[PDB]
């Protein structure tokens, strides 16, 4: 800890979360491939666009909230740039939807607590990086998004897709001070 340490990584972790959310099948799926290191990682892509509706509904554990009012999180995803994509269809989402998933830690299970809420839309660009590699990723997408709703606790990512072509790159999660000393 020269400076600050993250919360947790996607790839520190490497093995599983405990992930238990997917569709019935082809939508999103596991898959290893090469990244900026030698050895592989475990990732996820789901690419389909056929037809507009979808609502793949996945699941992110592995995460805790901070005393700040929220938290700093970094997701790395990488999509297939439709705008690159010589007549693809005209039918693929170029937007995501993001969620989170609060509670206590024993309590009662209400239907207004346990009612998810969307955070913000995520997209491409914004914040591209171009990389040499030759897995497949030629645009990674970083986007940086904060949460800390129930002040009690509660942690939870969620993604959701709707005919649309991107995959999970990389998570990690950071804790900021917001308000410095101030005497």
Same mark, same amino acid.
């Not at 919360?7 to 019935?24: M, N």
């Not at 171009?130 to 497949?136: A, F, L, N, P, T």
């Not at 990674?140 to 649309?164: C, H, M, W």
């Given at each position: 800890g020269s400076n600050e340490v993250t919360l947790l990584d996607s790839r520190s972790v490497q093995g599983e979360l405990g992930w238990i959310a997917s569709?019935? %099948? !082809? =939508?999103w799926e596991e898959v290893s491939i090469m990244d900026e290191k030698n050895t592989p990682i475990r990732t996820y892509q789901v690419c389909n666009v056929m037809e507009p509706s979808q609502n793949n509904w996945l699941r992110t554990d592995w995460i805790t909230r901070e =005393? +700040?009012?929220? @938290?700093? $999180? %970094? $997701?790395?995803?990488?999509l297939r740039d439709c705008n690159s994509l010589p007549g693809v269809m005209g039918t693929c989402k170029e937007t995501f939807n993001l969620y989170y998933y609060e509670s /206590? *830690? /024993?309590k %009662?299970?209400? $239907?207004? %607590? *346990?009612?998810?809420?969307?955070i913000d839309t995520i997209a491409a660009d914004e914040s591209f990086t171009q990389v040499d590699i030759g897995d497949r990723i030629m645009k990674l997408n970083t986007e940086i998004r904060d949460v800390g709703p129930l002040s009690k606790k !509660?942690?939870?990512l969620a993604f959701? /897709? @709707? =005919? +649309?072509?991107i995959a999970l790159v990389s998570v990690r999660v950071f804790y900021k001070k917001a308000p410095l000393t101030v005497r």
């Amino acid at each position: 800890g020269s400076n600050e340490v993250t919360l947790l990584d996607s790839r520190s972790v490497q093995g599983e979360l405990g992930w238990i959310a997917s569709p019935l %099948e !082809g =939508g999103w799926e596991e898959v290893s491939i090469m990244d900026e290191k030698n050895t592989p990682i475990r990732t996820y892509q789901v690419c389909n666009v056929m037809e507009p509706s979808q609502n793949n509904w996945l699941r992110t554990d592995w995460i805790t909230r901070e =005393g +700040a009012q929220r @938290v700093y $999180i %970094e $997701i790395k995803f990488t999509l297939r740039d439709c705008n690159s994509l010589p007549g693809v269809m005209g039918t693929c989402k170029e937007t995501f939807n993001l969620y989170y998933y609060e509670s /206590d *830690n /024993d309590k %009662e299970r209400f $239907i207004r %607590e *346990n009612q998810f809420v969307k955070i913000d839309t995520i997209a491409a660009d914004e914040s591209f990086t171009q990389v040499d590699i030759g897995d497949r990723i030629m645009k990674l997408n970083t986007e940086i998004r904060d949460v800390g709703p129930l002040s009690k606790k !509660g942690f939870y990512l969620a993604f959701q /897709d @709707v =005919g +649309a072509c991107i995959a999970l790159v990389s998570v990690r999660v950071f804790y900021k001070k917001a308000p410095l000393t101030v005497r």
